[PDB]
Design an enzyme around this catalytic site. Structure first.
Site, PDB file in Angstrom:
ATOM      1  N   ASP A   1      20.860  55.300  28.853  1.00 49.56           N
ATOM      2  CA  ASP A   1      21.815  56.377  29.049  1.00 49.56           C
ATOM      3  C   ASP A   1      21.233  57.437  29.983  1.00 49.56           C
ATOM      4  O   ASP A   1      20.058  57.400  30.351  1.00 49.56           O
ATOM      5  CB  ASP A   1      22.205  57.000  27.708  1.00 49.56           C
TER       6      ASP A   1
ATOM      7  N   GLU B   1      23.281  51.990  33.301  1.00 48.85           N
ATOM      8  CA  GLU B   1      24.511  52.676  33.664  1.00 48.85           C
ATOM      9  C   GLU B   1      24.703  52.678  35.180  1.00 48.85           C
ATOM     10  O   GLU B   1      23.820  52.293  35.952  1.00 48.85           O
ATOM     11  CB  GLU B   1      24.503  54.111  33.133  1.00 48.85           C
ATOM     12  CG  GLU B   1      23.756  55.102  34.016  1.00 48.85           C
ATOM     13  CD  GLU B   1      22.269  54.818  34.098  1.00 48.85           C
ATOM     14  OE1 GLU B   1      21.652  54.560  33.045  1.00 48.85           O
ATOM     15  OE2 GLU B   1      21.717  54.847  35.219  1.00 48.85           O
TER      16      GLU B   1
ATOM     17  N   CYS C   1      30.769  54.983  18.789  1.00 48.86           N
ATOM     18  CA  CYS C   1      29.754  54.819  17.757  1.00 48.86           C
ATOM     19  C   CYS C   1      29.085  53.458  17.885  1.00 48.86           C
ATOM     20  O   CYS C   1      29.744  52.446  18.137  1.00 48.86           O
ATOM     21  CB  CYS C   1      30.363  54.972  16.363  1.00 48.86           C
ATOM     22  SG  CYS C   1      29.140  54.889  15.027  1.00 48.86           S
TER      23      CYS C   1
ATOM     24  N   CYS D   1      29.815  51.083  14.253  1.00 45.73           N
ATOM     25  CA  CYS D   1      31.149  50.564  13.984  1.00 45.73           C
ATOM     26  C   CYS D   1      32.022  50.420  15.222  1.00 45.73           C
ATOM     27  O   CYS D   1      33.092  49.807  15.131  1.00 45.73           O
ATOM     28  CB  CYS D   1      31.871  51.458  12.964  1.00 45.73           C
ATOM     29  SG  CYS D   1      32.117  53.167  13.502  1.00 45.73           S
TER      30      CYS D   1
ATOM     31  N   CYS E   1      30.075  60.082  14.420  1.00 47.34           N
ATOM     32  CA  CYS E   1      31.476  59.685  14.425  1.00 47.34           C
ATOM     33  C   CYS E   1      32.074  59.860  13.035  1.00 47.34           C
ATOM     34  O   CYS E   1      31.394  59.685  12.021  1.00 47.34           O
ATOM     35  CB  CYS E   1      31.622  58.236  14.894  1.00 47.34           C
ATOM     36  SG  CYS E   1      31.904  57.025  13.580  1.00 47.34           S
TER      37      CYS E   1
ATOM     38  N   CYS F   1      32.484  56.444  10.208  1.00 49.50           N
ATOM     39  CA  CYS F   1      31.451  56.030   9.271  1.00 49.50           C
ATOM     40  C   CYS F   1      30.415  57.104   8.974  1.00 49.50           C
ATOM     41  O   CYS F   1      29.568  56.889   8.100  1.00 49.50           O
ATOM     42  CB  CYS F   1      30.728  54.775   9.787  1.00 49.50           C
ATOM     43  SG  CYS F   1      29.695  55.043  11.246  1.00 49.50           S
TER      44      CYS F   1
ATOM     45  N   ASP G   1      22.266  61.037  23.118  1.00 51.63           N
ATOM     46  CA  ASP G   1      21.692  60.222  24.184  1.00 51.63           C
ATOM     47  C   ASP G   1      21.305  58.840  23.676  1.00 51.63           C
ATOM     48  O   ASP G   1      21.556  57.831  24.347  1.00 51.63           O
ATOM     49  CB  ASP G   1      20.477  60.925  24.790  1.00 51.63           C
ATOM     50  CG  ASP G   1      20.805  62.306  25.321  1.00 51.63           C
ATOM     51  OD1 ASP G   1      20.947  63.240  24.505  1.00 51.63           O
ATOM     52  OD2 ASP G   1      20.918  62.458  26.556  1.00 51.63           O
TER      53      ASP G   1
HETATM   54 ZN   LIG Z   1      30.728  55.029  13.333  1.00 48.85          ZN
END
Ligand SMILES: [Zn+2]
Ligand SMILES: [Zn+2]
Ligand SMILES: [Zn+2]
Lengths: 392, 412
Positions: A198, A276, A312, A315, A324, A327, A363
């Site tokens: 990232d 990236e 996330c 999930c 997030c 979860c 990050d």
């Molecule tokens: Zn999540």
DNA sequence: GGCGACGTTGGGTCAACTGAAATAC
DNA sequence: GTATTTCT
RNA sequence: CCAGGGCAGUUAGGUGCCCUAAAAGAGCGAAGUGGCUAACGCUUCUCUAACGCUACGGCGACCUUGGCGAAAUGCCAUCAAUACCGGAUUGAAACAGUUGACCCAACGUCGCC
């Protein structure tokens, strides 16, 4: 070199952890004190031997036999294997510190209770596993002591050593009196040829592995300090070369980061780079990481930097430290050994291991999302379902 | 009798009383001398360990051991003069006598003088404090006579110390002449992490004859976030002071050190391939920022604590028995010793719970920490801070006995 | 991120010392 | 007088 | 958000001037970890940038103030700063320092989830 510290719980005469040996802590403390005293005595004997002229001295084998006899006589409670390990460790530490001794860079090396373990050879220690309980089977007949693993990695290493080659088992102590069971291991050497990276603003780069929890962040204090220095010096010059120096630093700082990323990829066995794609020359960094990774044959793939920080990792949920709401990845506390979420508490109910609050940085989450293979398909199958548009 | 220290930085080293001729490599000479002193201390400690580890029957007299250690110190490093040698042996003997019981119990790793920035110890007889014009010079004898004969340079090295403070000048001129005169002490040549050399003069001085009533006692309370609050037993006057950026400076220094240390993983080819010192050279500046900011803050807090007692005539200071709280307590007991104020240490157990007015014990007062209100007597009901309550509680003499007596009756 | 080994540095505590007579040159 | 070895 | 340093006796914060790609480059060597070699958070390591004047020897180099204080609440005046508008806000110091030992924390390499 490579070893793992295992917290101890109790000592049992039998391997079934049924009959506990009463007052085992005091016995182990006296044994460690005897070990330290014998090590100090034989190190003093080594110093006396080597301080004498070489011509007027006994043979090395005779010296080792005399040290073994002195160790056996001074503390008969110490078993033969432990005494032999003490003698060997004293010989090794004297070999490593004799030049410091005779240049007087250090005083006489001695073993305090903290740094004096009950050293035991691999031929007498057996690592057996019984359900959630882990048992060491040293022979001091043979004592069986409870071992409480506290991490998933330490469980995998322990299982591999039980079925890696064990080294010289060490039983140290601490200030509070907690005995640590440190099991060294050795492994065959085998080099190997998927990860991601990232990019923030001042955080520089962050990387995560697709199959391993290995983390590493380029803490860009260097870049921030350089930018602040350039700004301050430019302000001072205006009040009273810099641009070219900044451009050349930006041209060479991508080589350092590309080298670090390539070293991290080669380590832990990673052979694919999914990085990236595009205030700073990010195109230069992309070119440098593409060219420098091709030396080791690692292909570099450029992917869209859209909906990568917000996704996330656990999930895959997408929403507008990262946590997030689907979860609660950021705010959850999970046991290292089992990865099962708990409301609170530093001790797991299922394993009794260490429960650590997830320090999931934004990050790192973006890096782990970028590290996901076939990110385009998995983001078209998710962003389109939720109605969030992305540029393709 | 009390004792303080005068740490003076060395501007330069000379071989003439007028400081006309200087040693072009005096800094490396000081480093070599400090390393030799550390090596001599290490060998003395090793000899002490081998002596006391042997049975008493197979021992020479301890006097002969001291003589042998001094001779080996003088022969291993011929550059060390006699005074430095006996000072090193004395300091090694002091370390050994302080650590002997734990060495016998094998709970202590054998002491080792750090070669880097090691102190050079010299007796008060040799080094003489002189003042030639505005230059402040210490006539340190750092070279033996054998080394002087071999090299041709004199035994005396004139260290041009930096004395530019009014108080430092006053203490320097008070210790210069014995005629209330200051007595010299074991000179110490020690180096900071930056690389600057200091000549530290621990001078023994008579205790100040200030008329302070021992009946008046002032208590000192150390809170968790509230740094320190003091109160007087015989007078309702009191005072307090808290920490502004008390931990923020430590946090920022540690964060900067961590950020710089993490940079080596992606640094240039020089830091990663020229040793640990080359890698911690950027860290070297941060070697003592927060450690010395500990001393700066604790000096300020102790100064206000002792000054408050001096202004109000409080001849005694109460300190609870344990951020470096003990360092502040040590600075208090050393700064008050200068002014003749005795410090009594008491157990702070249940001190906050006990009311400062009625002395009753309570359990609900633990929950309320912002303010103190005693439910029974109503001292705070008729505003009294909890820190002020604890300070006034510990102000009165013989507080441990009162706590023990009250706890036995009720409140455990 | 953590579980550690080795190593170091970088914060604390804690306790004591911070010479003098005599003696050879 | 200065420096060193010794003793506490 | 205008950073890190050097000098200004120490520290911390400033300050007056200067330096910085020191979060940087290089050299000897083998005391150690590695494979006799030198890859290394390899070295008794070392060099690498920094105040003005000088007649090149040395000299000088600033501020953190004084009281009221039943209390980190602040007030009185005095100083410095403000990317706030001559005012308002912010801060306003003491120096006892060396040693070793123990504790904890952090960081570098390595092994692994
Ligand atoms: Zn999540
Ligand atoms: Zn678990
Ligand atoms: Zn009351």
């Amino acid at each position: 070199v490579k070893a793992i510290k295992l917290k101890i719980l109790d000592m049992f005469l039998d391997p079934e952890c049924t009959k506990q040996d009463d007052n085992w802590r005091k016995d182990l403390s006296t044994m460690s004190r005897f070990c330290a005293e014998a090590g100090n005595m034989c190190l003093r004997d080594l110093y006396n031997y080597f301080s004498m002229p070489k011509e007027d001295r006994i043979s090395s084998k005779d010296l080792y036999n005399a040290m073994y006899h002195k160790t056996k006589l001074l503390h008969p409670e110490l078993p033969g294997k432990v005494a032999n390990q003490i003698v060997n460790h004293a010989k090794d530490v004297w070999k490593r510190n004799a030049k410091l001794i005779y240049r007087n860079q250090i005083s006489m090396p001695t073993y305090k209770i903290t740094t004096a373990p009950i050293r035991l050879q691999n031929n007498i220690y057996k690592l057996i596993k019984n359900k959630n309980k882990y048992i060491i089977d040293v022979q001091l007949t043979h004592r069986y002591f409870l071992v409480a693993v506290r991490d998933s990695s330490t469980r995998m290493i322990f299982d591999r050593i039980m079925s890696y080659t064990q080294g010289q088992l060490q039983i140290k102590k601490d200030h509070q009196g907690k005995w640590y069971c440190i099991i060294p291991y050795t492994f065959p050497t085998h080099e190997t040829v998927v990860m991601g990276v990232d990019l923030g603003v001042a955080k520089a780069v962050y990387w995560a592995f697709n199959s391993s929890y290995k983390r590493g962040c380029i803490d860009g204090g260097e870049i921030e300090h350089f930018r602040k220095m350039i700004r301050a010096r430019r302000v001072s010059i205006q009040n009273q070369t810099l641009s070219e120096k900044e451009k050349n630093f930006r041209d060479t700082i991508n080589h350092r980061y590309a080298n670090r990323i390539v070293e991290a990829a080669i380590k832990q066995g990673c052979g694919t780079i999914q990085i990236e794609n595009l205030n700073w020359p990010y195109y230069d960094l992309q070119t440098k990481i593409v060219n420098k990774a091709k030396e080791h044959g690692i292909t570099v793939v450029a992917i869209n930097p859209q909906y990568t920080s917000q996704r996330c990792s656990m999930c895959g949920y997408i929403e507008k430290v990262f946590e997030c709401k689907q979860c609660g990845y950021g705010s959850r506390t999970i046991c290292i050994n089992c990865r099962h979420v708990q409301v609170s508490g530093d001790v797991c109910e299922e394993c009794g291991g260490i429960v650590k609050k997830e320090n999931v940085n934004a990050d790192y989450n973006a890096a782990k999302n970028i590290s996901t293979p076939y990110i385009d398909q998995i983001i078209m199958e998710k962003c389109l379902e939720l109605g969030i548009p992305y540029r393709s």
